[PDB]
């Protein structure tokens, strides 16, 4: 027996900046979005779902300094909360 399934489901994209806009990178320290993503994933993977963590990453960029960027979540079809349950 055959059944129908959504062609596109359970996706989440996270981009380093908004459309039209640059994303920053340091020659010795790496990309700010990547570094910030790792730090937030390290801290919050235990207690927050991935959508929540990505939002926290966005929040950390809220106050613009000399250089600014705003990470964007895109084309989301996650129907459930995705918890990493680190250690399990």
């Amino acid at each position: 027996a055959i059944k129908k399934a959504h062609i596109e489901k359970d996706f989440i994209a996270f981009c380093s900046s908004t459309p039209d806009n640059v994303s920053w990178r340091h020659p010795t320290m790496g990309s700010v979005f990547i570094g910030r993503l790792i730090e937030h994933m390290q801290e919050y993977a235990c207690s927050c779902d991935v959508e929540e963590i990505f939002r926290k990453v966005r929040f950390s960029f809220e106050q613009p300094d000399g250089r600014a960027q705003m990470p964007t979540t895109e084309r989301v079809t996650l129907t459930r909360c995705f918890y990493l349950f680190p250690g399990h």
């Binding site: 399934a5 359970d10 981009c15 380093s16 640059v22 320290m29 990309s31 207690s47």
Partner: protein
């Protein structure tokens, strides 16, 4: 569990979720969480594509730091990580198609895809990219290659795509007065 937390384990610097916390999350939300497979049998896969050396556009110095950080993190989270470097848009497509065909996805509960390169408004730059002859992989193509049609093994499973790239020339700011 040790008195003081240690980064010497498989999860490294990633803060651990306790059994008390895991059951609390299992209780606070009913049937609205993605199921996780048994740690003993699951074969989680992740792919990192990173372009640093380009034919015609500036060198992405510091990318090695990103590769190291993301590889170690995804491993900490339980994913077996493939790292591919300096690819054309065509090479990226071939690699993505191969990733979507990997047998391990069948015994996996999720996947992570990471792209790190130069970028324009339209998409992500390949190694041979120039203004005269564009070499671009569109975000749309990435989704298509990993959807239920082209990757049935990842049906009902979270697919996380992370992109570090410029999306145009603009600084992303406007002025205002307080």
């Amino acid at each position: 569990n040790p008195a003081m937390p240690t980064s010497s384990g498989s999860e490294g610097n990633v803060k651990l979720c306790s059994l008390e916390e895991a059951q609390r999350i299992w209780k606070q939300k009913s049937a609205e969480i993605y199921p996780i497979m048994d740690k003993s049998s699951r074969t989680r896969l992740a792919l990192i594509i990173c372009n640093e050396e380009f034919d015609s556009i500036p060198r992405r110095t510091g990318a090695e730091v990103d590769i190291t950080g993301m590889t170690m993190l995804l491993q900490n989270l339980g994913y077996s990580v493939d790292v591919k470097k300096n690819l054309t848009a065509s090479d990226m497509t071939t690699e993505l198609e191969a990733f979507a065909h990997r047998p391990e996805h069948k015994t996996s509960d999720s996947t992570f895809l990471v792209f790190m390169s130069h970028g324009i408004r339209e998409g992500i730059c390949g190694k041979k990219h120039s203004e005269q002859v564009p070499d671009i992989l569109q975000l749309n193509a990435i989704f298509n290659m990993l959807n239920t049609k082209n990757c049935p093994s990842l049906k009902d499973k979270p697919k996380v795509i992370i992109i570090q790239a410029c999306r145009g020339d603009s600084p992303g700011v406007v002025w205002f007065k307080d």
